Amino acid sequence: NPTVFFDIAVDGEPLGRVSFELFADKVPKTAENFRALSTGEKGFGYKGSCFHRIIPGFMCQGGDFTRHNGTGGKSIYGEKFEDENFILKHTGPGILSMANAGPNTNGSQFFICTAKTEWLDGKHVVFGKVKEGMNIVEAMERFGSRNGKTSKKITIADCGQL
């Protein structure tokens, strides 16, 4: 299983590094999309994009690098790809899963759980989990709010594969 990192920034100031194990063993197409978006090797990806929706007690959501407004994003396969499987579940804080607009609409947006979110099981594809830096994810919550709007700009200042 590959490992990728995000260097998170708050109004451009480094906050810390989060690293993720990606479950290529169980979810290869979805894991490969996130890995490639993180290295930027296709010429586009997560570097510079923001966590646009942070809701304390629930999740941190990001990944819109095409419209920069929470509505966009794109996969390495096309604008959207199918839900690969629902083998893995949203079992607690640190789960990494795909955001979507309904069945078979995976692009680039993703979320990191800060809680067990079992009602999302079978509707969002889980494909990784936080390895190191869960404390950075917990710190990102201070900047969120009930409607997910952030009080400072939370960005992926750097990202890549370890």
Next chain:
Amino acid sequence: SMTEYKLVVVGACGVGKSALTIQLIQNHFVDEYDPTIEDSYRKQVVIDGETSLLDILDTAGQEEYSAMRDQYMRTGEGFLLVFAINNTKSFEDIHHYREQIKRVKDSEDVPMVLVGNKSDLPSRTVDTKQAQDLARSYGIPFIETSAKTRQGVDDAFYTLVREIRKHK
């Protein structure tokens, strides 16, 4: 000497719930779609010579999270049922929002107004007559609106206040 009303705006995704509310509250429109999680607004108005505080809950156009949405409907005094005139599914969705409000409030007589939004656009798929017929069948007003041009915006919210004042 004042009154206060809890108004809730409901309807399918992208019909203009937020754009209508922001026009009422902030007197502007932007084309950019920012999907709602939940927003609340408060404004003092004068309607028919009577001053009121409007507390407006702008809901997301999703019907998941029934516990939360049920609470929205229990607390709300009156509801705008919004569809877009260029989205047939959003109009076909209207009866479900009405049924949910009746079931949660356990009542056949809840203040509501049917709002056909995006009336400025040249891509109509829902005929005005169909909407008027549905509102008549429900015994509620129908208002045509455009958040972009401000057509009918005050009218929609004020008519809902009149429906609450009448219901009481």
